[PDB]
Amino acid sequence: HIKKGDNVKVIAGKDKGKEGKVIATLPKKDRVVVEGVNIMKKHQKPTQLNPEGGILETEAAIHVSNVQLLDPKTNEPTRVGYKFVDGKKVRIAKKSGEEIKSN
Amino acid sequence: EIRDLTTSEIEEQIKSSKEELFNLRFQLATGQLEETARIRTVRKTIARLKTVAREREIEQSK
Amino acid sequence: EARDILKRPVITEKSSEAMAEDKYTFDVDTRVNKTQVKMAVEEIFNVKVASVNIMNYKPKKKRMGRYQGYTNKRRKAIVTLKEGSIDLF
Amino acid sequence: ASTGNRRSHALNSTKRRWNANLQKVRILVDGKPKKVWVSARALKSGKVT
RNA sequence: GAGCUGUAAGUAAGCUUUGAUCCAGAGAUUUCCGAAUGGGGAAACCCAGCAUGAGUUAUGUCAUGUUAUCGAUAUGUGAAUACAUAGCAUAUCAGAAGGCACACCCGGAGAACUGAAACAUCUUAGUACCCGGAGGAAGAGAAAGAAAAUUCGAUUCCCUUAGUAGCGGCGAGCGAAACGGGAAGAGCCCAAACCAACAAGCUUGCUUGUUGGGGUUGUAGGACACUCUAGAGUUACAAAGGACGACAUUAGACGAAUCAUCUGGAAAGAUGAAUCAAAGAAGGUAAUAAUCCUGUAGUCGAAAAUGUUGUCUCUCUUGAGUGGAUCCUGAGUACGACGGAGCACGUGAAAUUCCGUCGGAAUCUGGGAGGACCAUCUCCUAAGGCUAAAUACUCUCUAGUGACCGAUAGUGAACCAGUACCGUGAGGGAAAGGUGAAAAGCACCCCGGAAGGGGAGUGAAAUAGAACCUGAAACCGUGU
RNA sequence: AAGUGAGAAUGCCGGUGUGAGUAGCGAAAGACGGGUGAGAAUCCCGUCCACCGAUUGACUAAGGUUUCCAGAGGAAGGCUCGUCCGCUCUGGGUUAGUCGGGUCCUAAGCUGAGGCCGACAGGCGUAGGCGAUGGAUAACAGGUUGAUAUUCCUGUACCA
């Protein structure tokens, strides 16, 4: 799992092993958009809503299983487990250093 | 008007809202594009009002 | 009531020429009569209206742009006063 | 009330009905004396009521 | 658990750390038509009459509600024609009506083509259709029974007996039962006897019998007498009902641990070294993943729900020999004649079961039955009601499975399906899936009014450009 | 273990041939000048000529259901052509006390509470209810729009 405001290493891609910051969540297609990664050189149509619709650089959204968190206490790839003692849960980094970047 | 169930007389609030709605709808007609600042939520109030003002007939009167 | 019986006004090149003869056209509901509109425009605008004329409009076909569909029927009503002013533009 | 066959000498068969022998009487069921349809094998009680 | 505004997306802006898009609980409103029920009517429309709310000199207009015919009750009611009896209106009552899975059940009525190498008895067949009654199952069921063997016992269902006995223009064909081996397993409420004894406003109907108590059947039993006494357990029948838990099941729970190289546009592949395993089922991810997602084994179950209901009470209670001297034990019924039907059986020797018509018994010294009618010898008590279990079917819902289909296949329908279209109407009824990993869907220059080209650019690929995976024949062309 | 092998059933469905640049292109008479445009025998204006002429004229009703008006077109469409259009795309257009209906009233028929008849389903029928193509009820002279006129406006009357 992953929310909106962590940093992560991407493992399966042309740019193997690069860290950055997620911006937009996109649950609907299961995809992830990551800062400084896979700039599909969007080249839209000669519209007049999108101004002079053409080239620009917005980060193309890659699949949410190529991307994986990295352990806060170690900055190595992990999975995410969960316990709770309080109202909601607290994701435990499954490799002993527990993440409170709920924000 | 979320979660304010501590009221007896509400009808006059209703009429304020209804003349509100008529006025705001009558302008879109011309132009005036705040259609998402529009009455998609000057309407979602009125059912809160009416549901309680009517349960004040279903359970107290039978 | 006297608020849900009046929807939106008609702003065309024919209604603009009726403003000189003091004749405002409105889109009322398809269930009201020619007397309920005389007690809804004389209270909301507070003006002594003279006469009122209404006409029914049948639904249209559709368009090739989308898919085979239909249009909603409308009910026009031309209200004319003789001492009041305008309440729209 | 039911049905059956009518059989000929060479054993063919056609449908018929057996109807009950109903008559009319000034009698009582539900109040006033009425002229009603009863059958001769349903006269086990009185006649004029 | 951080997102949001239906499949179908973007916008155009708002909303939600107070708890937004939604996973269920639960009530509220629910325009008009439709059994449609205030009165009409060419369904989705029109015209009223009312007790409340509005306004105007009033009148007019609208909004809650009530105004149908049958049933059930406390009720009046009652012209001719004295008096009920037929009329009857204002009212009280919330039980019926329609629809639908028609597949499975139960009644009422009931074909023909076909087989017999024609055809009429017979056979298709009590089948198709039509009508009613309707349940989640229905129907059947508690001996006047089947039976010589020792008779052992309510009904249904599977396996035998058996294609046997039998029936038949003795032709085509139709076709048992006892018997044994199983699944499943309780039977009762009533009448009458008697008597404590008592209820019919004009009625809501003379056959007012109207409330108890008591009883239920064949070793012939209860009344009524010679005798005096406790538990059988009631929430699948006897007559109906809910407190009480624990547990088998239906959402959501947490859910074991992988790195490195090589080729590549990208690896899960090769290669090398490891590590969980009540999880090496399955799908996604830029190629073939037990360790990257979705889950799965299994853990809380689940704010519940019932299903096995395992369990306390609660109203469920009075029964125990005999005497047999009589009291009782269901009537136009038992039975008989004529005409028919259903039983495997064509009506026969026809016993045994139903309907129509006509006649018509005596009654526990009784009565009836033992596939003619007479004696014997057995056996059982008719003419009143009700009932779990074992069984039949699937519109649908949840979870699964397959030497089942893979777009002329599988549903008529994977997409714009009962849709285009066809008929006055009942009705008949198609064709149509695939760009890429990601729109990065060809910015720009040149020819043309445009369509479309030629360069360039994006991409692993542009003979992948929406006539978009692969691209076979028939057919149509240009060069040699 | 099988939905196991295709050349014929006037076989079912789809695609493409031959006949062939062949048959056909279904009511009045046209001719020139100017204009528009990438493109004109076919579109727009003008002048002359001709046809229908108790009708190819004008208006009610039935029926159809936006084909009506304006601006813009890429083809498809139209038996040729197209800059045109009853075709595609935006945005528009139908005004009633007296005009037709509804509402009053009845005809032929169609339904009917009690009431007869019938295996059931359901037939028939008395008051009553419904049902015009018939009866009873009140308008004219004029001026105006790219599209409505006894309806809008102006004068003037009539019915409740």
Domain ranges of chain A: 1-103
| Bridge partners of residue A39, in order along the sequence | A59
Q: Which domain holds residue C53?
A: 1-89
Strands (E), chain A: 7-10, 18-24, 31-34, 39-40, 58-59, 62-63, 67-69, 81-83, 90-92
CA–CA separation, A45 vs A54, rounded Å? 6
Do C23 and C1 touch, CB atoms closer than 8 A? no
Residue B25 touches partner C, C-beta closer than 8 Å: yes
**Chains D, C in contact, 3 or more Cβ pairs below 8 Å:** no
CB of D44 lies under 7 Å from some atom of strand E: yes
- State phi, psi for A15 to the nearest 5 degrees: -100, 80
Do A10 and A66 touch, CB atoms closer than 8 A? yes
Do A13 and A1 touch, CB atoms closer than 8 A? no
CB contact under 8 A, B22 and C44: yes
Nucleotide nearest to C17 (CA to C1'): F145
Q: Is the dihedral of CA C30, C34, C36, C41 positive or negative?
A: positive
Residue B30 touches partner C, C-beta closer than 8 Å: yes
Q: Min CA distance, B38 vs chain C (Å)? A: 15
**Beta strand pairing call for D22-27 and D34-39:** antiparallel
| Bridge partners of residue B35, in order along the sequence | none
**What is the separation, in whole angstroms, between the first and last Cα of chain C?**
24
Strand ordering across the sheet containing C49-57: C6-9, C24-28, C74-81, C49-57
Question: What residue spans of A8-92 are helical by DSSP H?
Answer: none
What lies within 8 Å, CB to CB, of C3 at 6+ separation is: B18, B19, B21, B22, C40, C44
What lies within 8 Å, CB to CB, of A46 at 6+ separation is: A52, A53, A54
By the 10 Å C-beta count (0-12 exposed, 13-18 middle, 19+ buried), A30 is classed as: exposed
CA–CA separation, D7 vs D15, rounded Å? 9
A98 closest CA partner among A74, A64, A65: A74
What lies within 8 Å, CB to CB, of B15 at 6+ separation is: none
Do C53 and C77 touch, CB atoms closer than 8 A? yes
By the 10 Å C-beta count (0-12 exposed, 13-18 middle, 19+ buried), C6 is classed as: buried
CA–CA separation, D34 vs D36, rounded Å? 6
B42: which chain C residues are within 8 Å (Cβ-Cβ)?
none
Q: How many CA atoms does the CB half-sphere of D9 hold within 13 Å?
A: 0
Q: Min CA distance, C3 vs chain B (Å)? A: 7
| Biggest distance spanned by C-alpha atoms of chain B | 49
Q: How many CB atoms lie within 10 A of CB D36?
A: 13
Do D47 and D27 touch, CB atoms closer than 8 A? yes
B29: which chain C residues are within 8 Å (Cβ-Cβ)?
8-9, 11
Nearest CA in chain C to B19: C3
Please name the method used to determine this structure. Answer: cryo-EM
What is the tally of structural domains in chain C? 1
Distances (CA, A) of A24 to A27, A30, A64, A80, C63: 9, 11, 12, 20, 38
Resolution (A): 3.1
Strands (E), D1-49: 3-7, 13-17, 22-27, 34-39
Chains touching B by CB (3 or more pairs below 8 Å) = C
What lies within 8 Å, CB to CB, of A33 at 6+ separation is: A22, A23, A24, A26, A59, A60, A61, A62
In this structure, what is the dihedral angle of CA atoms A69, A75, A77, A83, given to the nearest 10 degrees?
A: -60
CATH number for position C32: 3.30.70.330
Burial state string for C29-60 with b = 16 or more CB within 10 A and e = fewer than 16: eeebeeeebbebbbebbebebeebeeeeeeee
B25: which chain C residues are within 8 Å (Cβ-Cβ)?
7-8
**Beta strand pairing call for A58-59 and A39-40:** antiparallel
Do A95 and A28 touch, CB atoms closer than 8 A? no
